[PDB]
Amino acid sequence: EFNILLATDSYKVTHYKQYPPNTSKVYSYFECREKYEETVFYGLQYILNKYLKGKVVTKEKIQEAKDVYKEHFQDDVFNEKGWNYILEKYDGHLPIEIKAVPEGFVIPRGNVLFTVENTDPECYWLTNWIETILVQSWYPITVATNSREQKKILAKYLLETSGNLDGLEYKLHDFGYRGVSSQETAGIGASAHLVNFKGTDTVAGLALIKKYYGTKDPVPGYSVPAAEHSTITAWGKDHEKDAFEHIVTQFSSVPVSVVSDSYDIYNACEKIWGEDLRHLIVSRSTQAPLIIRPDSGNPLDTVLKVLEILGKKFPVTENSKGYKLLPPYLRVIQGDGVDINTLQEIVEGMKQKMWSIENIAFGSGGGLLQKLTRDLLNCSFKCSYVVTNGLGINVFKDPVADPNKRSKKGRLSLHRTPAGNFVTLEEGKGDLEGQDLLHTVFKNGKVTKSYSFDEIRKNAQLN
Amino acid sequence: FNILLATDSYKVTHYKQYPPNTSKVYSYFECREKYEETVFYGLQYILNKYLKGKVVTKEKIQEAKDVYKEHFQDDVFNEKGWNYILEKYDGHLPIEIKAVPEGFVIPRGNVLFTVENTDPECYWLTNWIETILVQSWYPITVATNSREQKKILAKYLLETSGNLDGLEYKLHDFGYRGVSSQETAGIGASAHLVNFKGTDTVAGLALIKKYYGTKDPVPGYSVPAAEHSTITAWGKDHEKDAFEHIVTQFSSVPVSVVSDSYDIYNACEKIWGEDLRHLIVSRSTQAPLIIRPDSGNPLDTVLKVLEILGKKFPVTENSKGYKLLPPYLRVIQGDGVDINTLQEIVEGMKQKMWSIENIAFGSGGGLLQKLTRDLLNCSFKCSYVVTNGLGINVFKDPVADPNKRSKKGRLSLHRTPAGNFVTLEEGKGDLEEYGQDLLHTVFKNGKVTKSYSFDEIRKNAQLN
Ligand SMILES: CC(C)(C)c1ccccc1OCC(=O)Nc1ccc(O)cc1
Numbered sequence: 001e002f003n004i005l006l007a008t009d010s011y012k013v014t015h016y017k018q019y020p021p022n023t024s025k026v027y028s029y030f031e032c033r034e035k036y037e038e039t040v041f042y043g044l045q046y047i048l049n050k051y052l053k054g055k056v057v058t059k060e061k062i063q064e065a066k067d068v069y070k071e072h073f074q075d076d077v078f079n080e081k082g083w084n085y086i087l088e089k090y091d092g093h094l095p096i097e098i099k100a101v102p103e104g105f106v107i108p109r110g111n112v113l114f115t116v117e118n119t120d121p122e123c124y125w126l127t128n129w130i131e132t133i134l135v136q137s138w139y140p141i142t143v144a145t146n147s148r149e150q151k152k153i154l155a156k157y158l159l160e161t162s163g164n165l166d167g168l169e170y171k172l173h174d175f176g177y178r179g180v181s182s183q184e185t186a187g188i189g190a191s192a193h194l195v196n197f198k199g200t201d202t203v204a205g206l207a208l209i210k211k212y213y214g215t216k217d218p219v220p221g222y223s224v225p226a227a228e229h230s231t232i233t234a235w236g237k238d239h240e241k242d243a244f245e246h247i248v249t250q251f252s253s254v255p256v257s258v259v260s261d262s263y264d265i266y267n268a269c270e271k272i273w274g275e276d277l278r279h280l281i282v283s284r285s286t287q288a289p290l291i292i293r294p295d296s297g298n299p300l301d302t303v304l305k306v307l308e309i310l311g312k313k314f315p316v317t318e319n320s321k322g323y324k325l326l327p328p329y330l331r332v333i334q335g336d337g338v339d340i341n342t343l344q345e346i347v348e349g350m351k352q353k354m355w356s357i358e359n360i361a362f363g364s365g366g367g368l369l370q371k372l373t374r375d376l377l378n379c380s381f382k383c384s385y386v387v388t389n390g391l392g393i394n395v396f397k398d399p400v401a402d403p404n405k406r407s408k409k410g411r412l413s414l415h416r417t418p419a420g421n422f423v424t425l426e427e428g429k430g431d432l433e434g435q436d437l438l439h440t441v442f443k444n445g446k447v448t449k450s451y452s453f454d455e456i457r458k459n460a461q462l463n
Numbered sequence: 464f465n466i467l468l469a470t471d472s473y474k475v476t477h478y479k480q481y482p483p484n485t486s487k488v489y490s491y492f493e494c495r496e497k498y499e500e501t502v503f504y505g506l507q508y509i510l511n512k513y514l515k516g517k518v519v520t521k522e523k524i525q526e527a528k529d530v531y532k533e534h535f536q537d538d539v540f541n542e543k544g545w546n547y548i549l550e551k552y553d554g555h556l557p558i559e560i561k562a563v564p565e566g567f568v569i570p571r572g573n574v575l576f577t578v579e580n581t582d583p584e585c586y587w588l589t590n591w592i593e594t595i596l597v598q599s600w601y602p603i604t605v606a607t608n609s610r611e612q613k614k615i616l617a618k619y620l621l622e623t624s625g626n627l628d629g630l631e632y633k634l635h636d637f638g639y640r641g642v643s644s645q646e647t648a649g650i651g652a653s654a655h656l657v658n659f660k661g662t663d664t665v666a667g668l669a670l671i672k673k674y675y676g677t678k679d680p681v682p683g684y685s686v687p688a689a690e691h692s693t694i695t696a697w698g699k700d701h702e703k704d705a706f707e708h709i710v711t712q713f714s715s716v717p718v719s720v721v722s723d724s725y726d727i728y729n730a731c732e733k734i735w736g737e738d739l740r741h742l743i744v745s746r747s748t749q750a751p752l753i754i755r756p757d758s759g760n761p762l763d764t765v766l767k768v769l770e771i772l773g774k775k776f777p778v779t780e781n782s783k784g785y786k787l788l789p790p791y792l793r794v795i796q797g798d799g800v801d802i803n804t805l806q807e808i809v810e811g812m813k814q815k816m817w818s819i820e821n822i823a824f825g826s827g828g829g830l831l832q833k834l835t836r837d838l839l840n841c842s843f844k845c846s847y848v849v850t851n852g853l854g855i856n857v858f859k860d861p862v863a864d865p866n867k868r869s870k871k872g873r874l875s876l877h878r879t880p881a882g883n884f885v886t887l888e889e890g891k892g893d894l895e896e897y898g899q900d901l902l903h904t905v906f907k908n909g910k911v912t913k914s915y916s917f918d919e920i921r922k923n924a925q926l927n
């Protein structure tokens with residue numbers, strides 16, 4: 001199974017010998033240091049339940065870690081005594097307190113999102129031990145934040161080229177299962193995406209949400225039948241029409257997506273879809289459109305040339321603001337080379353050519369869930385308050401060659417002014433008083449406050 | 464973990480899209496045509512952890528059926544096809560996977576492994592497990608990128624010192640905090656350990672021990688080290704007391720002490736170079752003090768650190784004409800190091816005549832996170848199908864991108880008479896004009912038939 005004593009950076013194993021004498025408390029916090037001006041806080045509850053809560057220390061896990069580290073360091077520097085103390089005194093529960101803003105809250109950059117401190121003075125070293133596991137919440141935060149920014153771009157352009165926001169939550173579809181680094185990442189990232197949208201093909205995201213968050217809806221995300229290259233090319237290069245015909249007929253009463261660029265996307269749209277199989281498309285209902293999927297070439301140019309061909313083979317209308325609109329049984333999804341930058345280029349290029357955003361949805365894979373780093377939001381975990389010799393000092397780092405790697409001081413609290421802006425109070429000044437938005441979510445091995453996925457989606461809504 | 468829930472959603476509907484009477488779906492993985500050769504590593508982890516043994520149960524089938532009912536707002540899940548696997552093969556996957564030995568260094572554009580169904584009723588299963596198998600792009604890319612950095616380090620360590628001693632400890636993995644999940648950390652750190660032995664990502668140690676095994680006591684090593692929180696906890700006026708306490712607590716092993724908490728150029732010239740000078744020269748060369756700057760421009764900072772340190776400690780010229788610190792004193796640059804910044808630093812030290820013996824490097828998110836599937840163009844494609852007794856060679860050929868063209872027919876990898884590699888298509892490998900097929904069966908009907916030790920993988924991935 002998973003062993004928390006082997007779930008930290010190696011140098012942190014030796015930290016219990018590096019503090020000043022008689023150190024009783026280490027206090028640390030997470031923030032997205034100072035374009036992404038506001039971030040969605042999401043993912044901590046998953047980490048608390050899966051890795052931190054309950055009996056996480058056992059006699060076998062202590063023996064396992066001791067053997068590994070003895071060889072790893074070529075020396076005895078494992079704190080077997082202190083880990084036995086946790087096992088004996090607390091039945092293997094972590095004497096730790098965590099306070100956090102509610103999940104789904106949208107918070108401007110440079111504010112405390114959660115804090116970590118030891119509740120037993122013998123475990124002063126435990127705060128920075130679990131930094132490694134906790135700081136990985138940068139990923140769901142960054143995915144949920146970058147996904148929400150793409151929802152602003154879509155909502156803005158879907159509103160000027162159409163006048164409404166119908167189907168907005170299905171306009172950016174998670175295709176990223178293949179392009180992420182692991183099954184666990186797929187689950188975490190896909191659930192972070194579902195904070196803002198409801199279309200996904202990464203099934204692991206559905207499983208994570210039901211197990212760790214829960215929803216009133218029958219399922220957190222939805223998809224539609226779709227073809228890949230292997231289901232088309234299997235019919236033979238001369239039988240692409242047959243492959244198309246078999247697939248739209250199998251799924252004639254539900255939406256179906258057909259990748260149409262196996263050999264020539266423009267021929268498939270002009271000759272195959274626009275003539276040979278046109279009778280099978282114009283007969284489809286509004287609730288069961290065909291979605292044509294280009295998957296190669298330049299993303300914007302191919303989208304423009306595909307829409308041009310479909311426009312001169314199917315009845316185009318002009319909507320309430322002067323933008324062109326395919327018939328309700330035909331749609332397009334661009335799911336190749338889509339990230340937040342290219343997505344902006346596609347929708348602007350379409351608006352420039354007077355096409356409505358209603359005609360198109362987007363699929364993002366490695367760009368939505370993989371090509372993201374801790375430096376995008378400058379997610380940072382710092383120690384700000386220690387107590388040595390019964391004397392608490394506000395600690396901080398302040399490099400001379402980089403003032404941007406600075407950190408806050410002392411005990412922190414997150415507050416909201418009467419005007420509404422957010423402010424992080426340092427040096428314990430939060431005791432002088434609204435009130436603190438950091439609620440306790442973990443204490444001494446138990447999760448003390450939970451949020452459902454519906455509550456998270458409500459907090460992360462746009463204005 | 465539920466294999467029936469571990470695939471792209473639309474793959475649930477593909478058993479109804481293949482041509483009728485399709486009895487075989489045959490698919491292959493390649494890194495489609497810097498990064499001219501790839502290290503093949505990571506498939507066995509996926510096989511052992513997710514694919515082998517009884518992976519289909521009545522519980523997992525019911526769980527998947529109810530999920531997909533609501534996910535698609537319709538019943539399309541192939542519950543009969545999954546029941547057949549549970550009933551006939553006791554939940555063992557009827558799949559055969561042939562792959563090149565892990566650790567092999569293969570040029571781009573070659574078949575790395577192939578997947579086919581062994582039961583005609585399970586034609587749909589081959590590309591069902593595409594999603595889980597294609598994620599091997601990540602360990603492949605990390606191992607390849609790590610090894611390309613090893614070439615750079617080896618080329619310059621030889622020009623400046625004459626040997627390659629300690630090469631496998633010159634690029635240290637600090638990526639645990641910067642990646643996206645615990646599993647990703649383990650996978651990524653093990654790929655680094657294919658070429659090096661130094662890591663702080665403990666999850667990689669456990670992943671290797673559980674899924675590959677080694678004859679060594681531990682797959683990776685590290686040393687005690689201080690972070691900013693253990694230095695600042697003494698207060699700004701007591702940075703000296705922290706340094707002396709830590710160096711004394713770890714005098715028989717190497718120790719790394721971060722020095723840019725307050726003022727790094729004050730850290731080397733003043734506190735190390737004078738106040739605690741007497742505690743640094745007095746340590747063995749097997750247990751030196753490692754100075755770590757972690758801010759500022761990487762190349763400029765390390766250069767100004769080496770020069771300041773020379774003004775305070777005896778620097779000798781090595782047999783090649785390059786400056787070399789006393790062996791009780793080393794430097795590690797682990798801030799913002801990737802394959803690009805590494806090259807300009809090492810020659811930036813060589814053109815400024817500093818020996819690469821002095822320096823080690825650490826890499827975090829640049830080593831394990833800022834990597835995507837299209838860096839090596841890792842792709843999984845169907846190349847051969849059998850329909851109504853007729854074998855057919857299959858491929859894609861998009862008009863706007865000839866680079867996305869896929870191979871045709873049954874594939875094989877061969878050693879050429881000149882000692883290189885070539886991939887044969889359309890079954891021509893059966894002629895064996897060159898060698899035997901280099902693809903060995905590693906998975907068949909739920910069993911791992913060929914397993915590799917991590918010691919074998921490291922041997923296959925060595926330089927030269
Ligand atoms: C038709 C639905 C999804 C209800 C819809 C409703 C409102 C607005 C847009 C919509 O379609 C977006 C789309 O194209 N999704 C899609 C999903 C998977 C896939 O493989 C191809 C495409």
Ligand SMILES: CC(C)(C)c1ccccc1OCC(=O)Nc1ccc(O)cc1
Pocket residue numbers: 011628629630632633635661685686687688717719753793794795823824
């Ligand atoms: C035995 C050692 C000292 C690893 C060694 C042996 C041979 C050659 C070079 C070496 O040092 C590389 C290094 O700096 N490793 C390092 C590890 C962790 C850390 O936090 C800081 C640094």
